[PDB]
């Protein structure tokens, strides 16, 4: 249990470049320096009282306790005046920046597989009875282009991702996560657009109650959009379950050009197996 979180010394790691900031502190690219040998092992570091460190560690053990190919795991923690958490570094960044930088080279087969993977991770957090509460394209990281992992879940401002019962009553279930999943797909199919951009956060809840939703993205057939819209029903139990979303986006992944309409789709396909095995033996040695 508690053997999954390694307690780190300030002396055995070093922040070296800033990647960004987020939900409790700033993220840096770092290096781990194993005691007694000289090898710089790249990591990611989030820089956030003694008793609050017991609240921190009690949750840290929870996030250090996950095991699923599509969920990120917390690997270490360093108790300093400001706390420092350490996870494996994903050289491909998050999917949000990814989809906004290759938006003219992403084919339909990747997009739908990203949806499958995110539903796989989410359904796993559901099976662990863990609620994400901040699911969003920024919180989906890219291990290899064929392989994404969800991050920074379970931390108890993202109003434009929140289900209506979270905006009005701070109710966070897995069914409220399904709603934010619905927005996350929408970030993907639109190659990184800011949902409800320019309509004040203060006024989102009145527009959802009124019955407006995010608009059908251009590359989406009705079949994909109808699933997004069912994720945004006002009644939580009517939204689909993640286990269903897995089956549905997997079906759509067996025939992608039927469900997403992208210009140039026939000139960009999956990696050959040759290319996936190469990617995996260099970068991605875990199970799936």
Ligand X SMILES: CN1CCC(c2ccc(-c3ccc4c(c3)C(=O)N([C@@H](C(=O)Nc3nccs3)c3cc(F)ccc3O)C4)cc2)CC1
Is residue 29 at the binding interface for ligand YY3, with CB under 6 A as the rule? yes
Interface residue with ligand X among 5, 83, 131, 224 (CB under 6 A) is 83
Catalytic residue flag (residue 134): yes
Binding mask 228-267 vs ligand YY3 (x if CB under 6 A, - otherwise)?
A: ----------------------------------------
Catalytic residue, candidates 58, 97, 127, 134 = 134
8, 74, 86, 89: which one contacts ligand YY3 (CB under 6 A)?
89
Structure tokens at 143: 């291990």
Give the x/- contact pattern for ligand X in 149-168, rule: CB under 6 A: --xxxxx-------------
Considering the rule CB under 8 A, would residue 75 count as an interface residue with a second copy?
yes
Q: What residue 41 binds from a second copy, ligand X, ligand YY3, none (CB within 5 to 8 A, per partner kind)?
A: a second copy
Sole binder of ligand X in the list 4, 6, 15, 59 (CB under 6 A): 59
* Binding of ligand YY3 by 152 (CB under 6 A): yes
Catalytic positions are: 134
**Which residues lie near a second copy (CB under 8 A)?**
3-7, 32, 34, 36-39, 41-43, 73, 75-76, 88, 91-92, 101-102, 105, 145, 272-275, 277-279, 281-286
**Which residues lie near ligand X (CB under 6 A)?**
23-24, 27, 44-46, 48, 52, 55-56, 59-60, 63, 72-74, 83, 85-87, 151-155
């Amino acid at each position: 249990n508690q053997a999954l979180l390694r307690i780190l010394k300030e002396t055995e790691f070093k922040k070296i470049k800033v990647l960004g900031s987020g939900a409790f502190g700033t993220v840096y690219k770092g290096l781990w320096i194993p005691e007694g040998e000289k090898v710089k092992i790249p990591v990611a570091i989030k820089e956030l009282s003694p008793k609050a460190n017991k609240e921190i560690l009690d949750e840290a053990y929870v996030m250090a306790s996950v095991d699923n190919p599509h969920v990120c795991r917390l690997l270490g923690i360093c108790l300093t005046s400001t706390v420092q958490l350490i996870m494996q570094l994903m050289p491909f960044g998050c999917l949000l920046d990814y989809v906004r930088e290759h938006k003219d080279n992403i084919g339909s087969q990747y997009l739908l597989n990203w949806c499958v993977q995110i539903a796989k991770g989410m359904n796993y957090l559901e099976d662990r009875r863990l609620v994400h509460r901040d699911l969003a394209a920024r919180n989906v990281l890219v291990k290899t282009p064929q392989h994404v992992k969800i991050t920074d879940f379970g931390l108890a401002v993202p109003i434009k991702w929140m289900a209506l019962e979270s905006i009005l009553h701070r109710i966070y279930t897995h069914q409220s996560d399904v709603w934010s999943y619905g927005v996350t797909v929408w970030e993907l199919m639109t190659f990184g657009s800011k949902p409800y951009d320019g309509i004040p956060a203060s006024e989102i809840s009145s527009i959802l109650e009124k019955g407006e939703r995010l608009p059908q993205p251009p590359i989406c057939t009705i079949d994909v959009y109808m699933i997004m819209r069912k994720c945004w029903m006002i009644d939580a139990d009517s939204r689909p379950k993640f286990r269903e979303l897995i089956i549905e986006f997997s079906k759509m992944a067996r025939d992608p050009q039927r469900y997403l309409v992208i210009q140039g789709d026939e000139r960009m396909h999956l990696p050959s197996p040759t290319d996936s095995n190469f990617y995996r033996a260099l970068m991605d040695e875990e199970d799936m």
